[PDB]
Design a protein around this ligand. Structure first.
Ligand SMILES: Cc1cc2nc3c(=O)[nH]c(=O)nc-3n(C[C@H](O)[C@H](O)[C@H](O)COP(=O)(O)OP(=O)(O)OC[C@H]3O[C@@H](n4cnc5c(N)ncnc54)[C@H](O)[C@@H]3O)c2cc1C
Ligand SMILES: Cc1cc2nc3c(=O)[nH]c(=O)nc-3n(C[C@H](O)[C@H](O)[C@H](O)COP(=O)(O)OP(=O)(O)OC[C@H]3O[C@@H](n4cnc5c(N)ncnc54)[C@H](O)[C@@H]3O)c2cc1C
Ligand code: SF4
Ligand code: SF4
Ligand code: SF4
Ligand code: SF4
Ligand code: SF4
Ligand code: SF4
Ligand code: SF4
Ligand code: SF4
Ligand code: SF4
Ligand code: SF4
Ligand code: SF4
Ligand code: SF4
Ligand code: SF4
Ligand SMILES: O=S(=O)(O)CCS
Ligand code: FES
Ligand SMILES: [Fe+3]
Lengths: 652, 291, 184, 138, 148, 374
């Protein structure tokens, strides 16, 4: 069939038209072979612009459509649906970018920008001629979800999916669910205990009939695609029989080895046989073989005889349709900002360490005390933006919660000890959500918390008393302050969790400049990823608070429930396929695919390569590496790309 | 090791003993110091960088060309010259617009900078290329005294281009002075400025002396017997500045001042007469009695 | 009271143009990234004994206050680079101060001592030239009576003079070649 | 009187987005380049670059994800091995290595893309036109 | 061209039929055993280096064999005789520039078992004559058919 | 839309198109819920399909009957800057694409009917009451911009060159009343100097709004970049207390506004705005708190970064659904952290700005969260 092309040059009001001479590009498009219709319009994506294409496809019997406008990353689906509504296959549509790639970057070179637009149109027309009609691959959806991370965000996703009636698997790396919320004493702006909201949810998710909780477990492998994922979960050995364990803790009172409690940020001491925190779920114990001396003293007091040192980790193979990543975050390590002396001075602590100190079930019994002498501080200084809004540490983002938790912990210290003097050293107070500004007003008006606008230059310790001096300019007075404190609290920012690299490779997802996980689109798909069937929820997607992490958990459940509810999903046909008549089975393609789609097989008594269509993601690496030309990626065939290259210099 | 020895101004024309001390110390360490004939002011960034940046870089590149024509790299014992020539070389290598502007000016005098010159500070050269172990091997007279080490500012900063490690908690000079038998005493605000830089000594003398006085006080409180620097500018400020502090504020310390080269020279059995300690405004005799 | 008429709106851009291409457009344009945190002021050794506030100089530049070029404060910076090392917004503070001083010098705000220093380099090639006592000292120490520097090389002194005239540095400091001295 | 003809090959996930970012931020750069879209830089092979030079390209640019950040996990590692061989093959054919430029630019790196376009344009403008097409048309 | 192919083409034209050439690459006709896991190259050797195994694919052994980028029909007498294919029959109908495609395939499989860590400079450094290795019989038909 | 500066409608339009032709979604535009009875899982709702007085099916959407209409009504879509007729279309990319007659300002002269070919105009059209049974209800009625007339020292409604940020959005918008040109309302000239005043109607006890409107810092910086892109010579100053750029890419957007676009920031909440009656120019009196000096800079246009308030119909919807309000006057969620999109009334949920001031991704995420919960 001979190509009948319709070329549409968008003006985008004046965004394109103001730099590129669109009428002249339209005249030039008409001189190209196979171009039957060429028109220029103010807004091609608008109703009149879309109806103009549909009417021409019918009235001029077009079999190809070229739109010279903005980016396919913005309107490729839009124009695909538009042409499909007129009966034209969506893979016979080609987009030429003359806005972001031309009019917006060559504003002072109008003549050259117009000639560039003509070449970009000729390149689009060149590829268009050889485009072919393609059909989407329909695949089934396994009615089961997987949630990675058992924090407030992950728990919310699993509870919502479970409540909807979908089988869900919740994998938690540590022995207990709850996450960082469990480490906090209170939570802003209601000043409720973190337990108030979290514990009931932890209890609910642990006994939910549609949620299978795998605590102290990790996802070690994920294979497949949307609706057809094959996952491997490694159930780490706790060395205790969970079904026989009571969780009384008679064992902990006999263990003679002391290990620093990771839950208390090293500020607390736990035993080899431990329970993360008193409200932990599952209420079971765990033996750390890295520090266990295997004396067997805990086994003598254990009544049900659950302790078993011969326990081996179990690999559980599970099939899921959608995956939700809710692995959270880690607190920034402030050792790098050496002027503040963290890791050098005993009385310089992080805010997460203060949470453990203030917490009633913490290592200090809920008492804020100096680590140098065990005394309670009379003067405390909070230093904001530690590890955030700072190019020197490579973190040029706002960690979102540090203004609010500093004010919250200050209110909590004032409640326990009103005589305490508290100063907060800040740049901007970010109390941006519901009841936050009011919480900020309350901190100053009711609790007498003081605010000093000035980012401290350095902290100096008195080696003799352990007291610290904060050097900072009070920018609102234009004077340098050198106030002394008994304790300095660094309001550390958020960073991706240490395991984020492992999870990224397993799920095949991307990261944004802040190093957190990349959402499909900031505005319209905040919990989806560009990888179909993989979603995000909580702090692992970016620094945010509990209300936002809970809402994201619910948002992810809804989005991950769409493919499950549908029971069938479509996959892009821009995949690789082997021409059996040309392939002599050289085997070069096999190892190039990271998903193992291309496979060697026997057909008609001889060896030939064959691609498992569902496994192809459409990168185009194996067809580029095929030495016989038998392997080709539909929509990015070598002949198609060759014509596109020719199109820059000449027609056809 | 062969290096074009950049002298500067203060060392070769005022504190000449620092030159003599460097010449023998570097010879003992196996460094061939070749004369950088016709080398002028770096020029001092304090006045030139502040007056006209174009003039500072053009005149700095002119000096770099002298060493480039010799086919050898530069070495200096002054933080001011190090900072000036090093930042000039970096800027010419990283910025082509700046290189074009400077080469268009140097073409008038038949010169052209090609970017083959590396500027080195003798302290970091001794630390990274020779080794601190070689200092101890050449020690003829161990100097068992307390030293108030003054790194200065243009030695390690800016760290983004210098790449000599930490500027907040360095060990480079402390390990070099400790290799002579001395002890680097820790004092308050160790990394602070002497006050002489950026043309402050010449324009705001009292301001510069206030900062030097604080450094001297902190060193004396730490138990220091003397102060060591790697900058004839810091040297002048600590030495001549003590006379000014006595004439203006009325505070007398008589704190001996030494340039690392002179400290290494004393340690390597050099005659105090060849180090020109007599030209120092503050007597080094109390220190000479302790060693 | 500060009115629009008392401000020079292009001061920031003017400071950037004076820094292009030396120390660089990207280096001096960093003054626009300043978020007035005060870390530079708190780190300043000079600020601890004077009215000089590093942050206010950057503020005065961004706002357009003309007096910053006439102020004595910009000349109190020792160029220790501590603010440059600690700025969380990557402001090349020390380089911006030096570039502002260039505009100050063009306006005529140069100390006599700084100009005398600039004259010695133009006349003798050195900021601190050799005298009769230098020759005597170097002799007794065992060094060459006259160092191998530009001071004793007419070829190098004439090379610098050609560059200085081309750069317009002689006109900046107000040096008269015939009289062999500075004017004003 | 003459302007370089530069052809570009950019991956849809990172460099294509990086080029769009430069456009959204009105980051101006020279108009010599014409970009071709591929899904991954792993789609790029010697045949596409050599074909561009045959057609008259004065310079060829290729953009992909950062090493380790490929949307398709490792497509850019195959392209990296192919481009190193291609650089030396171009020199054997009398084509300056500098006429080929490959960079790793993300979807958020608009400023980097702008400076890469400026630097590559200046590099090719200084080299002058590639006389391959003229020699072949004789 | 083999004598039979010449007769087949001429005979088809005498009858009035359109002549048809074989379409696959040489590995089809080559009797050497291939790894079912796929092709993986560890090092690159020149034809005189080492002693080649007579059963295993020469490309997997580290020799530049053009068979992967060459049209079948010859009967693969070169690999059968103990030497790699030199690509004298030219590329298949789906490949324009044989050398470019051979380079693409070779670079892709070189160190594929260690893909993320293999040094991309070993291969270009190991081949001192690239045009002679990949364009022996097809340089004039290549995209860049001359040295400037 | 910040922080990507994507065209708002160019990215929202596809979703409007999708929802209008979705097989499982029945869209009742120009309609209102007038009654809700029952309980969770058994709600009986009454929807009033308002009469457009134009035949829906015979309506082409060309717009030729408006030219003859003699009544000029201020266009709500253009925030009162523009003038529309009694017969109209909200915006050019509206979904569904059909015209409507506003009987609150219609004089029934019949001049539009004489020009109309299809004779779609029918004044005897009657609103239809649709009875529907639903199990769950999601309230997503949004918000309204704060009216800054109350802060009289700023002179909004008195001075011609004092505008709100939502009015500026329309002036900047290509399909707006000024054709995408930022111009002074006093003389139609482009302003060379612009001042943005933050927290107008927010963080203010005098107007009864002690909350942060969440999006004003970001939209002021965004619109300042859009003006700089259109006219780089323009001088822009932002008068603030705290710059709240708290989410992903927001702090970077703030850094970019200053470093790349040369937008200036003045820490100090203005005391008052004074108009020069001779020129129409405005003077902003404010203390530069970072200098401890009073500024009195002159501008060609003053933009008030107005906060968010509940929509005008919120009272009606509250009574119909039987839901509560929080101190900020927005709808009350069951729990700020245990249930952010649920209400204490079973089967009734919330989504978007009607629950509290927030940006697009937060509203979109809440929309998805509400779908899951409902
Ligand atoms: C000092 C401090 C005080 C704060 N105060 C408040 C406050 O008062 N109010 C408020 O709203 N917010 C506060 N925040 C923010 C709050 O902590 C977060 O909003 C919240 O914890 C985010 O929940 P999350 O589930 O997304 O992440 P997380 O709480 O970090 O949960 C992640 C979970 O995933 C698990 N996980 C990690 N890796 C893996 C893996 N590979 N496989 C399986 N599971 C894995 C983790 O063990 C963890 O249980 C504070 C933060 C800090 C640092
Ligand atoms: C000047 C300005 C600039 C902004 N810029 C940005 C930006 O750059 N980026 C960004 O992310 N956010 C921005 N925002 C915030 C953004 O406007 C909101 O996030 C967004 O509109 C929230 O959408 P919504 O659906 O919740 O409410 P709305 O957008 O207000 O929509 C509510 C809908 O409900 C309808 N409705 C109302 N009452 C009833 C009723 N009784 N019955 C039926 N329907 C009803 C309305 O007609 C309306 O269509 C800005 C806000 C302002 C004021
Ligand atoms: S198609 Fe693209 S360029 Fe044209 S009006 Fe729409 S967004 Fe603007
Ligand atoms: S292991 Fe035994 S002793 Fe320890 S908590 Fe479990 S049941 Fe009690
Ligand atoms: S056997 Fe292990 S867990 Fe039990 S008491 Fe001994 S060290 Fe502790
Ligand atoms: S929330 Fe506050 S303390 Fe935290 S990074 Fe942002 S401004 Fe700094
Ligand atoms: S690389 Fe090409 S010829 Fe070789 S097995 Fe794969 S499809 Fe067949
Ligand atoms: S084109 Fe990419 S994803 Fe598809 S089969 Fe080949 S290597 Fe695998
Ligand atoms: S440290 Fe940097 S951002 Fe902070 S006030 Fe000083 S120059 Fe500005
Ligand atoms: S460089 Fe200047 S302004 Fe900065 S801290 Fe040092 S003396 Fe102060
Ligand atoms: S030796 Fe050559 S022709 Fe034979 S299988 Fe190996 S690559 Fe193919
Ligand atoms: S070089 Fe020629 S004859 Fe030898 S195997 Fe290859 S194609 Fe056949
Ligand atoms: S009412 Fe009539 S004239 Fe107006 S848009 Fe509808 S069909 Fe057109
Ligand atoms: S009848 Fe109503 S809508 Fe029609 S022209 Fe008259 S006032 Fe306008
Ligand atoms: S977001 Fe910014 S402008 Fe808006 S109320 Fe909060 S602080 Fe004020
Ligand atoms: O005054 S200068 O800064 O040039 C030298 C001090 S090291
Ligand atoms: S997708 Fe960008 S290189 Fe693979
Ligand atoms: Fe659009």
């Amino acid at each position: 069939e001979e190509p009948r092309i319709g070329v549409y040059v968008c003006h985008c009001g004046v965004n394109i038209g103001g730099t590129v001479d669109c009428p002249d590009v339209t005249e030039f498009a008409k001189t190209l072979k196979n171009v039957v219709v060429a028109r220029d319009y103010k807004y091609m994506c608008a109703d009149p612009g879309q109806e103009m294409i549909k009417k021409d496809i019918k009235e001029h019997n077009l079999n190809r459509v070229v739109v010279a406008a903005c980016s396919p990353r913005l309107h490729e689906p839009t124009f695909r649906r538009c042409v499909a509504e007129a009966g034209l296959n969506p893979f016979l549509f080609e987009f030429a970018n003359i806005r972001e790639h031309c009019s917006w970057v060559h504003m002072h070179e109008k003549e050259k920008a117009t000639e560039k637009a003509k070449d970009l149109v000729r390149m689009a027309v060149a590829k268009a001629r050889l485009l072919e009609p393609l059909e989407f691959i329909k695949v089934g959806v396994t009615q089961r979800a997987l949630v990675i991370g058992g924090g407030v965000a992950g728990i919310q996703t699993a509870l919502d999916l479970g409540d909807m009636g979908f089988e869900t698997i919740l994998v938690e790396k540590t022995p207990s669910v709850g996450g960082r919320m469990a480490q906090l004493d209170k939570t802003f702006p209601t000043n409720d205990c973190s337990i108030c909201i979290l514990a009931p949810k932890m209890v609910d998710v642990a006994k939910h009939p549609n949620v299978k909780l795998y605590a102290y477990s990790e996802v070690v492998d994920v294979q497949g695609y949307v609706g057809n994922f094959k996952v491997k979960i490694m159930k780490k050995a706790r060395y205790i029989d969970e079904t026989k364990c009571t969780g009384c803790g008679q064992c902990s009172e006999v263990c003679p080895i002391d290990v620093p409690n990771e839950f208390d940020m090293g500020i607390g001491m736990r035993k080899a046989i431990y329970k993360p925190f008193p409200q932990a779920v599952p209420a079971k114990y765990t033996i750390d073989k890295e520090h266990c001396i295997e004396c067997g003293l805990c086994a003598k007091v254990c009544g049900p005889n659950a302790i078993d040192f011969d326990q081996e980790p179990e690999i559980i193979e599970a099939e899921v349709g959608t995956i939700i990543c809710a692995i959270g975050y880690d607190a920034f390590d402030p050792t790098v900002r050496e002027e503040y002396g963290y890791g050098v001075y005993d009385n310089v602590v992080t805010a997460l360490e203060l949470e453990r100190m203030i917490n009633a079930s913490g290592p200090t019994g809920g008492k804020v005390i100096r680590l140098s002498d065990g005394q309670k501080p009379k003067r405390i200084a909070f230093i904001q933006c530690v590890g955030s809004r700072d190019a020197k540490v490579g973190n040029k983002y706002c960690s979102n919660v540090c203004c609010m938790y500093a004010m919250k912990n200050s209110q909590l210290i004032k409640e326990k000890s009103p005589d305490t003097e508290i100063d907060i050293y800040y740049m901007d107070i970010r109390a941006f959500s519901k009841g936050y500004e009011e919480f900020y007003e309350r901190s100053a008006k009711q609790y007498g918390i003081k605010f000093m606008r000035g980012r401290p230059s350095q902290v100096i310790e008195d080696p003799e008393t352990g007291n610290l001096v904060v050097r900072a300019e009070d920018t609102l007075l234009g004077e340098i302050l050198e106030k002394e404190y008994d304790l300095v609290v660094l309001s550390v920012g958020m960073v991706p969790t240490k395991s984020a690299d492992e999870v990224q490779k397993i799920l095949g997802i991307s990261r944004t400049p802040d190093q957190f996980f990349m959402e499909a689109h900031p505005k319209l798909r905040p919990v989806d990823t560009a990888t179909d069937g993989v979603y995000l929820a909580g702090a692992c997607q970016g620094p945010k608070d509990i209300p936002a992490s809970v809402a994201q958990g619910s948002a992810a459940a809804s989005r991950a429930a769409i493919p499950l509810a549908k029971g069938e999903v479509e996959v892009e046909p821009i995949i690789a396929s082997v021409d059996a008549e040309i392939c002599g089975g050289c085997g070069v393609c096999v190892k190039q695919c990271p998903y193992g789609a291309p496979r060697l097989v026997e057909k008609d008594g001889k060896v030939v390569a064959e691609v498992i269509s569902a496994l192809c993601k459409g990168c185009g690496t194996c067809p580029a590496g095929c030495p016989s030309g038998a392997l080709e990626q539909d929509h990015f065939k070598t002949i198609q790309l060759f014509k596109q290259i020719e199109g820059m210099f000449r027609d056809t | 090791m062969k290096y074009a020895f950049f002298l500067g101004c203060i060392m070769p024309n005022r504190y000449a003993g620092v030159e003599a001390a460097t010449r023998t110390v570097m010879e003992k360490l196996g460094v061939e110091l070749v004369d950088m004939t016709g080398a002028s002011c770096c020029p001092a960034p304090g006045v030139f960088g502040s007056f006209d940046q174009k003039t500072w870089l053009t005149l700095a590149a002119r000096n770099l060309c002298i060493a480039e024509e010799m086919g050898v790299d530069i070495v200096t014992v002054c933080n001011g010259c190090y900072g000036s020539l090093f930042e000039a070389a970096h800027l010419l290598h990283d910025n082509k617009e700046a290189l074009n502007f400077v080469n268009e000016k140097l073409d008038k005098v038949g010169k052209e900078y090609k970017g083959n010159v590396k500027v080195r500070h003798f302290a970091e050269l001794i630390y990274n290329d020779i080794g601190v172990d070689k200092i101890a091997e050449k020690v003829e007279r161990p100097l068992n005294i307390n030293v108030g080490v003054h790194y200065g500012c243009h030695f390690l900063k800016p760290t983004d281009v210098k790449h000599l490690g930490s500027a907040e908690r360095p060990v480079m000079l402390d390990e070099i002075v400790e290799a002579t038998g001395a002890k680097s005493v820790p004092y308050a605000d160790k990394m602070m400025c002497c006050g002489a830089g950026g043309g402050v000594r010449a324009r705001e003398l009292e301001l510069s002396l206030d900062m030097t006085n604080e450094k001297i006080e902190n060193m004396i409180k730490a138990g220091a017997d003397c102060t060591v620097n790697v900058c004839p500018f810091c040297h002048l400020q600590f030495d001549r500045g003590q006379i000014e502090i006595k004439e203006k504020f009325g505070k007398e310390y008589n704190f001996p001042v030494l340039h690392l080269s002179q400290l290494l020279g004393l340690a390597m059995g050099m005659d105090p007469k060849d180090l020109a300690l007599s030209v120092h405004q503050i007597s080094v005799d109390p220190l000479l009695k302790k060693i | 009271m500060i009115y629009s008429s008392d401000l020079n709106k292009n001061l920031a851009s003017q400071i950037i143009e004076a820094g292009t291409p030396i120390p660089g457009d990207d280096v001096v344009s960093s003054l626009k990234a300043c978020y007035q945190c005060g870390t530079c002021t708190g780190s300043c050794p000079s600020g601890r004994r004077t009215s000089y506030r590093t942050r206010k100089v950057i503020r005065k530049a961004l706002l357009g206050m003309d007096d910053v070029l006439d102020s004595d404060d910009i000349w109190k910076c020792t160029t220790c680079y501590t603010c440059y090392e600690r700025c969380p917004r990557d402001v090349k503070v020390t380089e911006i101060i030096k570039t502002i001083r260039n505009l100050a010098a063009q306006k005529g705000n140069m100390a006599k001592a700084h100009k005398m220093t600039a004259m010695y380099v133009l006349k003798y090639g050195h900021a601190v030239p050799a005298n009769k006592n230098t020759a005597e000292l170097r002799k007794s120490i065992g060094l060459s009576e006259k160092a191998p520097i530009a001071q004793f090389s007419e070829k190098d002194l004439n090379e610098m003079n050609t560059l200085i005239k081309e750069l317009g540095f002689d006109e900046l400091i107000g040096f008269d070649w015939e009289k062999g001295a500075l004017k004003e | 009187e003459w302007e370089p003809k530069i052809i570009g090959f950019c991956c849809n996930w990172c460099t294509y987005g990086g080029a769009d970012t430069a456009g959204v931020g009105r980051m101006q750069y020279p108009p010599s380049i014409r970009i071709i879209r591929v899904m991954c830089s792993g789609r790029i092979e010697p045949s596409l670059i050599l074909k561009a030079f045959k057609e008259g390209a004065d310079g060829v640019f290729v953009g992909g994800c950062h090493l380790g950040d490929c949307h398709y996990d490792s497509g850019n590692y195959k392209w990296q091995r192919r481009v190193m061989m291609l650089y030396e093959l171009l020199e054997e054919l009398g084509i300056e290595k500098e006429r080929l430029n490959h960079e790793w630019i993300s979807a958020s790196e608009g400023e980097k893309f702008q400076n890469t376009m400026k630097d590559f344009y200046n590099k090719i403008e200084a080299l002058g036109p590639c006389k391959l097409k003229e020699e072949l048309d004789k | 061209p083999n004598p039979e192919m010449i007769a087949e083409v001429v005979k088809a034209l005498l009858e009035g039929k359109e002549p048809e050439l074989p379409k696959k690459n040489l590995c089809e006709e080559c009797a050497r055993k291939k790894s079912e896991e796929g092709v993986a190259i560890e090092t690159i050797k020149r034809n005189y280096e080492g002693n080649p195994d007579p059963e295993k694919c020469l490309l997997e052994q580290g020799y530049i064999c053009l068979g992967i980028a060459t049209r079948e029909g010859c009967g693969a007498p070169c690999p059968s005789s103990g030497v790699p294919c030199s690509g004298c029959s030219g590329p298949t109908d789906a490949v324009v520039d044989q050398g470019a495609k051979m380079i693409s395939a070779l670079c892709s499989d070189f160190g594929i078992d260690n893909d993320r860590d293999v040094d991309p400079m070993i291969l270009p450094k190991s081949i001192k004559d690239k045009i002679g290795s990949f364009y022996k019989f097809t340089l004039p038909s290549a995209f860049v058919p001359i040295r400037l």
